[PDB]
Each structure stands twice: as structure tokens, then as C-alpha cells.
């Protein structure tokens, strides 16, 4: 009985794993019993959890083992690669499938989470100190990049201006989902004196989404008035944010307890509800500005406990981020291997991004930013995120409803170039800003 | 602006309510968005929450306001009355409905929870000190009460012995769901020296359910062999409990952290899975003994942290109890007002309960219990619980499948008398034992 005596003391190396496996299988059985639909290996909820775990392990691997010597390996590239691998394997694409509506809802939820996290961390008096530079950085470079991309596309691909206008509007847009965490980390660190520069970027790269989607919708309609519709959407979002601000302003008082969890849940639910209501009513994207205005008003309410809830919101964002990246990167199966002289698209997107950098450097030549701040701001505006993927999916769906072969091919080319741009410029830009933060604004 | 100045300081009296209402409506909207099915006011999940809240408020009212001077008002009566009111109002019965399968699953879950809570709190060495009295109290009085009830029914109602046998088997059964909390509270209190008496009752009033259901199934089949089937079920339950005991015995070790939550979740999930597997395979009720054996083995594992998990399991049971009572009491709509000379049924059930008390006093005349312990044990075995309702529902469903009018009427009479017995003897017995605990075994 030597083996029995030796194995009598439990071995935590071989005991922890068994306990974890038993707990996981028990939870999975409970989930299956509660709902036998979309919980099987061929279901959606199983696929969501599998994608979440794959994104988590990919992010860990891209940064814990094969990270470069000086620059750490960002997890964004790992998450995008995991999504690409999940989507682009036929034998591992039929087993795991996700509903389009669920994907869109999760994308909206993640965008609302990152927007409210950015708004909560914003510092006051920045608007009064320098709002003009923020407004110019929000307005100018987006339109300039869209126009330059349209010009570059024209006389190059042969598509009419309507397709060129749509491509320029789609490409010329930066979504804060990829840049906000970097700005928040930089502000938490701090180099020299942060004279509102991180908050400046956070505010500037937030509400250009409404203008981008308005232009895209107008161009799509012309390819098939609404500028006033978008203006009304902006006004409605501002008014809703102003109205909702007075609620967190007073209802949470010192009398109540557990203010952290209650306030965080309240603001997150309000943001999600506003975004979903705006999308359902018929004018999506206004909730994106509404939640930012609500967070700004909550800061104006002098909550004095931002860091109490900032930690919880940061944890929630860290949970949601791999899911968001996997959802974005797991919708490229159609063009998995379609070489159609993609080098033209690569050249167009690269030239457009370079023009964006140049104009962003031009847009910050007024005052304050001498050299290093100019360069950092220019390189910070570079990346793009979920907004481009969502608008491209909408454009492709519209094209494949009453369109012929030529329009289908044009939409396919636009979707491919947009996906490639999202794949390239986002993680490279994130790594660049992460490495340049401690190296430019010290 | 006098009103504005006066209302400028928030009033927590009028502010807490608004915040709670906003949180509740936000959660309800989230639930509706996640699932638009069975979450509407006409759905099931809405009905479950409404029943839970009604049971909670009824239990609070029956004990916080209209409690008698010396004896506090038990909440069991309030919960049963709330269930009766919910079920027996046509305009408030169509709006809230609950699936039969969901009700049965929740009943099984609650029974498993109370069984594992009883088993965890059991004290060792009690079996070796006096197991014979426990075995006799488990076996004898159940069969004697069933036989006496059958005899009383015969020559009284005119139904044949097959119906009389079924009625006696159904009536002659005590389910621990109503007595275990009282025993645990009494053991926590302690009067003089508790020489295993509470644990004796907890063990004795646990595994008679298998014998009761086996007899009921055999009688139902005869009305349409299985004794060996029930014996095999008991053996299978014992073997499964023995096998599962070695798992909590070693897998949770000192290396792991958060032992309380992990162990509690593990044991609860194992009990639920065992009960559901036993029910699905074709031999229900064996999991009821299996979970008790598993808890006894976990105690034999010297967990030394029972009170750490006993608190959590007690909280879970306190959550589930109003739901269980509401589910039991919300299935009497058919016979809401059907006076069919019910006094005969009342007399039969009263005589049967009195005979149960007399034989229980007779069964404890061996040793140890001198006078007061005898009386307390006799009065403790009195109540009945969910088991009778479940078996009566099964009997009625079997009757209304291939049966004629006479069999339907017999089944209806049996169901009515069973419901009346559950209504009467359970809360009265609970209040009696609660008041007599500090007054008999001091």
C-alpha cells in the first residue's frame, strides 16, 4: 500500500485542477438545464463563452511569452488574431456561431461602457481652458481625411463618387474604443504636468462618431435632407444627457449606503438604455454623446468618489474588451483568401492615414503643444475601431438587398479594405502610443 | 424660490424610494431585453418574482404586526395564505401563471436544499449512540398511520381498498421541509444538554419519504413487483452518496482559497444534480437519501468549517422557503369553493393525526426519553410538507389520463383532503414546536 500511503496527502497540483473542472462542468450543466437552447456546443451562449476564453488566452499569450524585448506585445493583436482564426476555419465555424443581433447589441454595450469610462475620468475646467482645439481636432481632420481618401480612391479604382464618398466617410473615422484605455493609463501614470492633454484627447476623439455616421447615411441615401436629421439627433442627445444629469446629481445622497456599486450600476444602465433607445427609435449614435454628457454632468455633480467607481468600471471594461475585439475580428470569413490586387487598397489606406497624421499635426499648431505634444496628439488620432466595422456591415447589408453584381463587388471591396485597415492601424497604433507615452511627454 | 431653497437639500425619505424604483425598473428592463419571453406580466418569470415578493410580505406581516401576545405568529401560515390568495382569484390567476415543470423543479431544488442543510448540521456519534430508536421512528409510525387512515376511510366513504390504500399512503408521511428549520434553531439555542435529540429527529424524519413514495407507486400500479424496485433505489442512493462522499473528502484542501463558497456551491450542485438525475432516470426520491448521505460523509470528512458554510446554506434556505410555500399553496384553484361534506375528510385526517401522535408516543417508550422528550418527539413528527402535495398531484394526473368519472371524483376528494391536511397540520405544528421547544426540554 505504498502508493496509497504516498497519495494519502492531497496534491494541490493535481487537486486544484480537478476541483476547477468539477465546478466548471457543474455550472455548464446548470446552464444547460436552465436553457437547453443556444447553450449546446452548436449554440450561441456556448460560442460566446468560447470566444471570450479564446480572446483572453490570446491576449495573455501576446504579451506574456512572445513579447519583444523593449516593447511589450499588446493584447489587441492577439485578440484580433483569435477572432480571425475563429471565424476563418470552416470546421471551427459551423460548430460556433453567433447571432448578428446579439453581436450588434454587445458591440453597442461595449462602446457605451468605454464611453462612460472615458467620460467619468475626464477632468473639469479643461473645456473652459481649451475647448477650441478640441472642437477643431474633432471636426477638421475627420472631414479632411474623408475628402483625401475619396480623392485617392477616385481615378484609381474606377468606382463613382458615390462609392468613393462612402469609402472616404467610412475610412475617415476614429472610434475611442481603442484609444481611451491608453489615455486613461497615461493619465494615471502622469509625466511632468498633464495640462489636460489626456482629457483633451478623450473629449476630442468621442463625438466625431455622430458626424461620421451622419455622413455615411447621407451618402448611402444619395447612392440609393438628413443633415438636419443628424443635427436634431445631436441636439436630442445633448438634451437627454442634460436631463439625465440632474438625476445622478441628487438622487444618490449620503443617506444611502453602498454608493459605489449603486452609482456605477445606475450610470451604466442609464447609458445602455439611452444607447438602445436611440438605436431602436430610428436615430442611432446619439446615445454615444448622451452618455458622455451624462458622465460629464456626474463629474459636475462633484461625486468626489470617481476612483471608487472608476475601479469597478475599469474591471468591467477589462472584461468586455476581449469580447468586443473577438466580435469585431470574427466576421471576415467571406474574404478569408480573396487576392484581388489588394495592394491598391493597402496603398489607399496608408496614404489616407498618412494624410490624417499630417493634418492632425497641422490642426495642433495654434498654441500650447510645442513639438512633442504635437507629435503625440498626431499619432494618437491615428487608430480606428468598432465604428468602421459596424458601418461597413450596414453598408454591405444595404448593398445585398436590392443591388446587382457591380454594387455587390464594390461593397465587398469596401468591406475588405475597411477590415484590413482595422486589422492594421488599430493594434499598431495602440502599441505605438503605449510605447511613446513614457517617451514623448516626459 | 422658497420651495426651491427648501427642497435643495435632498430628502432621504423621498429620495431612497425613487432610487430603489429606478434600480428596479432598470433591472426589469434589462431582464425584458435579455428575454422577451416569459418575462412579460403574463409570463412565468414575472409570476415567480411576484409570488416570491407576495410570500415575503405575507411572512413579514404574519409575525411583525398581528402576532399574538405570547406566541409569535409563524410566517408559514402567511406564506400559505398568500399562495391560496394568488391561486384562488380568477382575475389574478390568468395574469400570473407558472409552468408545472418549473414548479416541480423548484420544489425538488428546495427539498434538496433543506435536506443538505439538515445533513450538514447533523452531529456525529449519534447513530452509534442510538440508531435503533431513529430507525423505529422512521419505519413504524408511518406504516401504522397509513394503515389506521386506510381503516378509518374504509366503511366511511365507500371507496375500495385500492383508493383507501393510496389515501393512507399519501396522508401517512412527514416531509422534513417544515420541521428541519425548527430543529436547527432549537439545536442552535440549546436547553440543558442536547443529547442528540434534535439530530435524532433530523435523521429520523428524512428517509421515510422513499418508503412513502414506493408504497404510493405500488398502490397506484395495483389500482391500474415494485417493492424490489424501491429497495434497489434505496441501495443505489446509498451507493451514490458513499461514492460522492470521497470527493468532498479530499478535493477541497487547505491549498485552495475561498473554501466556504466553493464547498457550499459544490455540495449544493452535487445534491441538485443527484436529485435531478434520479428523477429523470426513472426512480425519483433516491437523491433525497443520497444528499443526506453525502452531507453525513462530508461531516465524517471533518470539514471543521460547518458554521462557515452553514450560514450560507441557511441564507439560501431562507430565500427558497417562501418560494416553496407559495408554490405548494398556489395549486388549489379547482376546489376553491366545493363544499362536498368536507367534515368527513376533516374527521378522518384529525383521527389519523391523533393516531400518529399516539403511536409516536408509543414508539419512544424504550429508553432515554422520560416524559418531556417523549411528548416533544411525538408532537414533532406531526406535520407534513411538499411530499404530500407532489404525490397528490401525481395521483390526480394519473387519474385524469385514462379514468372515468368515479375515479376522477375519488382523486378529487383525495387531493382536497390532502390539501386541507397540508394547510392545517403544517403551520399549526410548526408554531406548536416553536413555542414548546423552550417550554418542554429545558
Curated annotation (Swiss-Prot), chains A, B:
General remark: The subcellular localization of SLC9B2 remains controversial. Was initially thought to partially localize to mitochondria. However SLC9B2 does not seem to contain a mitochondrial targeting sequence. It was later established that its localizes predominantly in plasma membrane or intracellularly to endosomes and lysosomes. In another recent study, endogenous SLC9B2 in the distal tubular cell line mpkDCT4 is detected in recycling endosomes but absent in plasma membrane.
GO cellular component: apical plasma membrane; basolateral plasma membrane; endosome membrane; lysosomal membrane; mitochondrial membrane; plasma membrane; recycling endosome; recycling endosome membrane
Origin: domain of life: Eukaryota
Name of the protein this chain belongs to: Sodium/hydrogen exchanger 9B2
Protein family membership: Belongs to the monovalent cation:proton antiporter 1 (CPA1) transporter (TC 2.A.36) family.
Catalytic activity: Li(+)(out) + H(+)(in) = Li(+)(in) + H(+)(out); Li(+)(in) + Na(+)(out) = Li(+)(out) + Na(+)(in); Na(+)(in) + H(+)(out) = Na(+)(out) + H(+)(in)
Protein topology in the membrane: Multi-pass membrane protein
Keywords in alphabetical order: Cell membrane, Cell projection, Cilium, Cytoplasmic vesicle, Endosome, Flagellum, Lysosome, Membrane, Metal-binding, Mitochondrion, Sodium, Synapse, Transmembrane, Transmembrane helix
Gene: SLC9B2
Purpose of the protein: Electroneutral Na(+) Li(+)/H(+) antiporter that extrudes Na(+) or Li(+) in exchange for external protons across the membrane. Uses the proton gradient/membrane potential to extrude sodium. Contributes to the regulation of intracellular pH and sodium homeostasis. Also able to mediate Na(+)/Li(+) antiporter activity in kidney. May play a physiological role in renal tubular function and blood pressure homeostasis. Plays an important role for insulin secretion and clathrin-mediated endocytosis in beta-cells. Involved in sperm motility and fertility.
Subunit structure, as described in the record: Homodimer; dimerization is essential for SLC9B2 activity. Lipids seem to play a role in the stabilization of the dimerization subdomain.
Molecular-function GO terms, alphabetical: identical protein binding; lithium:proton antiporter activity; metal ion binding; sodium:proton antiporter activity
Extracellular side: 35-43, 92-101, 158-163, 282-285, 336-341, 398-410
Residues that hold Na(+) according to the record: 174, 205, 208-209
Side of membrane Cytoplasmic, spans: 64-74, 120-130, 173-200, 249-263, 298-314, 365-385
